[PDB]
């Protein structure tokens, strides 16, 4: 899709990556140089509260906990700076990704969709009756392809999603959809309303609730070519994926 830079050296951001971030800002913002000159070195900038990591009473129903998890994710803000602040190697053992999610909560910087998936896993490992599985969507608009990922969830046989997007309709879904197909079709319709064609859906397996697991997340357990499949086989493949997940414990 559209390229972006990634901070690959931890925090604080190293000098070269920091300059690269501002050079990118000066390129794409019509007032890019003036923006840097106002912000860089300024001593009167707002203090940003560090968002409080939500903790849950055992009497609180899981869907209410998920609302709080999503509110926390949103509080960090979608990262529009052009530089991703945490590097996510998707094939890392879960325990390493959970260490990274912990650092996201300590450092409290803006994030994009994949970081939010990792954070959503970290913040729901305390909910063993909730199953979590990544859902990636590839869409098409005006000659370019777009990649998006959310954390699908299943509570008591109902499907929803957590995550981060620059669009309000492409992240949070309360766990109320009767079937996985209905959840994915809702995302497809949301994409269509903002004129994106849904091309591929990639669904992962259920993710362990053990933050010290050495297992990898299995991102691409089902890879569905929406137009090639057509409507009926699309639904059947999503039903099959939902069954596959019910058996991974």
């Amino acid at each position: 899709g559209v390229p972006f830079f990634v901070n690959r050296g931890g925090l604080p951001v190293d000098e070269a990556t920091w300059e690269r971030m501002w050079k990118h800002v000066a390129k794409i913002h019509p007032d890019g140089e003036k923006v840097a000159q106002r912000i860089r070195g300024a001593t009167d900038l707002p203090k940003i509260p560090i968002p409080s990591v939500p903790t849950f009473q055992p009497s609180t129903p899981v869907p209410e906990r998920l609302e709080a998890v999503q509110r926390y994710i949103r509080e960090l803000q979608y990262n529009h700076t052009g530089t991703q602040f945490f590097e996510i190697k998707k094939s890392r053992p879960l325990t390493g990704l959970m260490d990274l999610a912990k650092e996201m909560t300590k450092e409290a910087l803006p994030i994009k969709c994949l970081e939010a998936v990792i954070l959503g896993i970290y913040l729901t490992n305390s909910m063993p009756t909730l199953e979590r599985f990544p859902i990636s969507f590839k869409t098409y608009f005006s000659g370019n392809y777009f990649r998006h990922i959310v954390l699908g969830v299943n509570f008591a046989g109902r499907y929803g999603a957590l995550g981060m997007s620059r669009r309000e309709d492409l992240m949070y879904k309360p766990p109320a959809f009767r079937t996985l197909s209905e959840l994915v079709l809702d995302f497809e319709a949301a994409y269509g309303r903002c004129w994106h064609v849904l091309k591929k859906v990639k669904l992962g397996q259920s993710v362990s609730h053990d933050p010290h697991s050495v297992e990898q997340i299995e991102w691409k357990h089902s890879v569905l070519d929406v137009e090639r499949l057509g409507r009926d086989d699309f639904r059947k493949e999503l039903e099959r994926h939902a069954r596959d997940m019910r058996l991974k414990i």
Binding site: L11, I39, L45, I48, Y78, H80
Partner: protein, 33 residues
Amino acid sequence: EKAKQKSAQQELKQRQRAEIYALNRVMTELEQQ
């Protein structure tokens, strides 16, 4: 002097975080309209 070195690192992160969020507000407003 390890406690002071961590202090300098934490201050670096604080100054950077404030600039990141100030920049993010500007770029968010640009991305929207």
